Ligand binder design. Structure first.
Ligand SMILES: O=C(O)CCc1ccc2ccccc2n1
Ligand SMILES: [Zn+2]
Ligand SMILES: [Zn+2]
Ligand SMILES: [Zn+2]
Length: 99
């Protein structure tokens, strides 16, 4: 996984309500394999369910998303996982909610 990407600039502040790692997909309602968008904090399902986060990427252009299953961060432009100090706050808030 990459130690930086040129899309980390689009990672936005964490809502003061925090994150709910059990939040369902905003399109289909599935509780399985959701991701949270690190720009707008909408929650959509992964590619193996109904691909709604991929659809969100395409209709918004938002680059980076966080898995509620393992707290990895994927960039859809770089087609890679990324970790950087800029992702620790959001990973830590999700880790606290999850565990
Ligand atoms: O939309 C999702 O399923 C999330 C983005 C994601 C995460 C890991 C990937 C690995 C290989 C190919 C595509 C990936 N996409
Ligand atoms: Zn969905
Ligand atoms: Zn978004
Ligand atoms: Zn990137």
């Amino acid at each position: 996984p990459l130690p930086w990407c040129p899309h980390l600039v689009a990672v936005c502040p964490i809502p003061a309500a925090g994150l709910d790692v059990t939040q369902p997909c905003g399109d289909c309602g599935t509780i399985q394999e959701n991701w949270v968008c690190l720009s707008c904090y909408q929650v959509y399902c992964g590619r193996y369910i109904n691909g709604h986060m991929l659809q969100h990427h395409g209709n918004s252009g938002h680059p980076l998303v966080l898995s509620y299953i393992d707290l990895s961060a994927w960039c859809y432009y770089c087609q890679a996982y990324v970790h950087h100090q800029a992702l620790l706050d959001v990973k830590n808030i999700a880790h606290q909610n999850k565990f």
